[PDB]
């Protein structure tokens, strides 16, 4: 079951989220525990780099903050549930097999 999966996230799990989180990324950032101030910093600091880079930076900051113990398949699954991205949750289930 995806929500109890304790596997540490690596590129293979993160890549579908990097590619598809898309323009509606900030609500998922809040569910991943970023404050509005932190979201604003990412939004401003990576404006010239583009939306995909804002997404990349947000996800990587989360993986770095939570570490190997905390940045897991099951925790990402819960975040995707909480931010209502069942499309992304489905891609995560498939890549985790
Ligand atoms: C926390 O998230 C809520 C939405 O759930 C938002 O209204 C509020 O502004 C956020 N606060 C901060 C400090 O990010």
Swiss-Prot record:
Disease named in the record: Immunodeficiency 57 with autoinflammation: An autosomal recessive primary immunodeficiency characterized by lymphopenia and recurrent viral, bacterial, and fungal infections. Patients exhibit early-onset inflammatory bowel disease involving the upper and lower gastrointestinal tract, and develop progressive polyarthritis.
Compartment annotation: Cytoplasm; Cell membrane
Free-text comment about domains: The RIP homotypic interaction motif (RHIM) mediates interaction with the RHIM motif of RIPK1. Both motifs form a hetero-amyloid serpentine fold, stabilized by hydrophobic packing and featuring an unusual Cys-Ser ladder of alternating Ser (from RIPK1) and Cys (from RIPK3).
Subunit description: Homodimer. Interacts (via RIP homotypic interaction motif) with RIPK3 (via RIP homotypic interaction motif); this interaction induces RIPK1 phosphorylation and formation of a RIPK1-RIPK3 necroptosis-inducing complex. Upon TNF-induced necrosis, the RIPK1-RIPK3 dimer further interacts with PGAM5 and MLKL; the formation of this complex leads to PGAM5 phosphorylation and increase in PGAM5 phosphatase activity. Interacts (via the death domain) with TNFRSF6 (via the death domain) and TRADD (via the death domain). Is recruited by TRADD to TNFRSF1A in a TNF-dependent process. (Microbial infection) Interacts with mumps virus protein SH; this interaction inhibits downstream NF-kappa-B pathway activation.
Organism, as annotated: Homo sapiens
Lineage of the organism: Eukaryota, Metazoa, Chordata, Craniata, Vertebrata
Protein name as it appears in the record: Receptor-interacting serine/threonine-protein kinase 1
Gene (UniProt): RIPK1
Glycosylation site list: 30
Family: Belongs to the protein kinase superfamily. TKL Ser/Thr protein kinase family.
Source organism, top-level taxon: Eukaryota
């Amino acid at each position: 079951a995806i929500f109890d999966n304790t596997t540490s996230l690596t590129d293979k799990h993160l890549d579908p989220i990097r590619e598809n989180l898309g323009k509606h990324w900030k609500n998922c950032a809040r569910k991943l525990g970023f404050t509005q101030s932190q979201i604003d910093e990412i939004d401003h600091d990576y404006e010239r780099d583009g939306l995909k880079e804002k997404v990349y930076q947000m996800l990587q900051k989360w993986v770095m903050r939570e570490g190997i113990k905390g940045a897991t398949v099951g925790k990402l699954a819960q975040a995707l549930h909480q931010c209502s991205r069942i499309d992304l949750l489905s891609s995560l289930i498939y890549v985790s097999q």
